[PDB]
């Protein structure tokens, strides 16, 4: 790596934050529900496997 490091930095930062600063902020919300889903369900799936 040597050029793909700065080329990528400007590929998303100067494209996904200047053209969709209002949408990207709202879309990022999906990261919260996804983690919370996998974070709370990873425990429930164990209740049935540890009993049946």
UniProtKB/Swiss-Prot annotation:
Residues 1-31 are cytoplasmic. The modification N-acetylmethionine is found at residue 1. It comes from the Eukaryota. It holds the Pfam family Phospholamban. Phosphorylation by PKA abolishes the inhibition of ATP2A2-mediated calcium uptake. Phosphorylated at Thr-17 by CaMK2, and in response to beta-adrenergic stimulation. Phosphorylation by DMPK may stimulate sarcoplasmic reticulum calcium uptake in cardiomyocytes. The modification Phosphothreonine is found at residue 17. One of its GO terms (cellular component) is sarcoplasmic reticulum membrane. The chain crosses the membrane at residues 32-52. NCBIfam families: P_lamban (TIGR01294). This is Phospholamban. The gene is PLN.
